[PDB]
Chain length 179, copies 2
């Protein structure tokens, strides 16, 4: 409604539902991390890079979403184009992944964690790649469902990327460090 | 920049610079966590709640920002109305913080870390409270600086919430676990 004419309790009632849904979805991350407690306890430094990994996926996805939302609005793209966009973006995400990975591997090299060099390097590439597709396709899904991306797309991409990003990161870590 | 006529390489060049800046800025969080390696070592379960703590903050901040950006764009609010918003959002942020904290506390108890009930519980309240303020004020700071908030708020709020969110969580953890 109108912010100028809404009270604190009113704003709370208007915002709480969507935040409760998101956190209930976000709680899964804590379950995912606990399931990988063996690798986490063995190599403490794995925890150090969780925000950057997931945060970079969130940036990448939401950057992708903003582009697709704009194109659909201006009728530069139609709903039927989601497959063509999917095929092109998977090429864009790979390039973005390899680029950003190079920088983060350098950071890990600086911090002095040689075992995490391939772990963080591989994972970020996959994270940026998958976060990019999710960000690219989500506006197509919301337009089809009749939902407006404005207050929905950004946190959805971020929460989905956190969950997917953790699953990728921790699996790579397990495979390379515990196997 | 027309998307339908732009190739993969073209899209790549037009996107990297902003993503490169964001990850370089984001690297701060990595150093922050290393500075609190002591508590991370002491309690492993401390790391289990980092993404949900920072994620909830980012969502909270993006929400309040999106509301303010809309109010300023539709002339529902003036730039000079920042103080009124700030005072109102203190109440909204507290209520939101208390509500979400109650839920996350249940999850910590579900996960089986009663040790982490107070630290995670208090932290989310503080995180939501401050993330909501950052979100509500950033459009005001941006427009006053000659930059429309709708273009750059979302990456900014997420990064600020991650950095400040970590600092709150880990400092609370340090005080109560050490
Ligand atoms: C084999 C590793 C590949 C090397 C890639 C090098 C790229 C370096 C770019 C930024 C690193 C920033 C690190 C920041 C270090 C100071 C942090 C304190
Ligand atoms: C999950 C991976 C891709 C999401 C698929 C995109 C979902 C968006 C559906 C787009 C769509 O419904 O557009 C008409 C299409 O041709 C038929 O329905
Ligand atoms: C905390 C940061 C709050 C930043 C608030 C900026 C306020 C501003 O942009 O100025 C509006 C008005 O012109 C000045 O009274
Ligand atoms: Mg985030």
């Amino acid at each position: 409604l109108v912010y100028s004419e809404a009270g604190p309790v009113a704003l709370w009632l208007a915002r709480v539902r969507w935040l409760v849904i998101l956190i209930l979805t976000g709680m899964v991350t804590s379950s995912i991390l606990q399931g990988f407690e063996s690798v986490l306890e063995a190599v403490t430094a794995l925890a150090f890079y969780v925000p950057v990994l997931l945060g970079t996926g969130g940036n990448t996805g939401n950057q992708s979403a903003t582009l697709i939302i704009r194109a659909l609005a201006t009728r530069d793209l139609d709903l039927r184009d989601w497959r063509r966009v999917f095929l092109k973006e998977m090429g864009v995400g790979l390039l973005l992944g390899l680029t950003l990975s190079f920088l983060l591997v350098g950071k890990v090299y600086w911090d002095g964690h040689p075992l995490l060099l391939p772990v963080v390097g591989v994972s970020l590439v996959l994270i940026v790649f998958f976060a990019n597709l999710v960000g690219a396709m989500l506006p197509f899904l919301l337009r089809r469902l009749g939902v407006d991306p404005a207050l929905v797309s950004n946190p959805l991409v971020a929460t989905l990327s956190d969950v997917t990003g953790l699953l990728i990161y921790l699996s790579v870590a397990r495979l390379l460090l515990e196997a």
